[PDB]
Amino acid sequence: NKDQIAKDVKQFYDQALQQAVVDDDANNAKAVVKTFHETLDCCGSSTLTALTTSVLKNNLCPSGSNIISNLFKEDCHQKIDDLFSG
Amino acid sequence: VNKDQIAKDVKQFYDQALQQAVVDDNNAKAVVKTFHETLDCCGSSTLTALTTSVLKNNLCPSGSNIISNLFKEDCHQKIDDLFSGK
């Protein structure tokens, strides 16, 4: 089921992001998050965490990304929805 | 939540979308095309592009010849890479 898998992937991402920003330990989290961000061209679960993440933990955001554009760009949840919806 | 399970689920979802996409001929096509564009791949295996109607129907990323696909990673690998952090 599309919806369930989308939910699961978004949840997985959320976990990875929480770990990534909160604790430098759990080292895979950063990699997972950075690849999710690079793959989907986003920087957060929301524009708030995208904004919060683009600043202060920029090392895991895409290169071409203005902080103010992160405020307008789609979050990763939206991009995941887009991924699974087509 | 579990990385392996979700990866399995996403790969399965993709497989379904791909089967529908190629065996038909329409939202399957969109899902598959976006998966392919997002992950830069064209099949569940290196063989699909070779045996299925993916290449025509314009379902592959730009400039993706049959040759290249045989030496590029399939979508399953890219999904694994996505969820593993590679």
UniProtKB/Swiss-Prot annotation, chain B:
Q: Where in the cell is it found?
A: Cell membrane; Basolateral cell membrane
Q: What is the effect of changing residue 11 to E?
A: No effect on integrin binding
UniProt modification remark: Not glycosylated. Likely constitutively palmitoylated at low levels. Protein palmitoylation is up-regulated upon coligation of BCR and CD9-C2R-CD81 complexes in lipid rafts.
Span covered, complete protein: 114 to 201 of 236
Q: What is this protein identified as?
A: CD81 antigen
**What terms describe the molecular function in GO for this protein?**
cholesterol binding; integrin binding; MHC class II protein binding; MHC class II protein complex binding; transferrin receptor binding; virus receptor activity
Source gene? CD81
Question: So which disease is it linked with?
Answer: Immunodeficiency, common variable, 6: A primary immunodeficiency characterized by antibody deficiency, hypogammaglobulinemia, recurrent bacterial infections and an inability to mount an antibody response to antigen. The defect results from a failure of B-cell differentiation and impaired secretion of immunoglobulins; the numbers of circulating B-cells is usually in the normal range, but can be low.
Cystines in this chain: 41-75, 42-60
Note the site residues: Important for interaction with integrin: 3, 29, 33
Q: In which tissues is it expressed?
A: Expressed on B cells (at protein level). Expressed in hepatocytes (at protein level). Expressed in monocytes/macrophages (at protein level). Expressed on both naive and memory CD4-positive T cells (at protein level).
GO cellular component terms, alphabetically, are:
basal plasma membrane; basolateral plasma membrane; cytosol; extracellular exosome; focal adhesion; immunological synapse; membrane; plasma membrane
**Sorted UniProt keywords:** Adaptive immunity, Cell membrane, Disulfide bond, Host cell receptor for virus entry, Host-virus interaction, Immunity, Lipid-binding, Membrane, Receptor, Transmembrane, Transmembrane helix
Lineage: superkingdom = Eukaryota
> What's the stated role of this polypeptide?
Structural component of specialized membrane microdomains known as tetraspanin-enriched microdomains (TERMs), which act as platforms for receptor clustering and signaling. Essential for trafficking and compartmentalization of CD19 receptor on the surface of activated B cells. Upon initial encounter with microbial pathogens, enables the assembly of CD19-CR2/CD21 and B cell receptor (BCR) complexes at signaling TERMs, lowering the threshold dose of antigen required to trigger B cell clonal expansion and antibody production. (Microbial infection) Acts as a receptor for hepatitis C virus (HCV) in hepatocytes. Association with CLDN1 and the CLDN1-CD81 receptor complex is essential for HCV entry into host cell.
What organism is listed for this UniProt entry? Answer: Homo sapiens
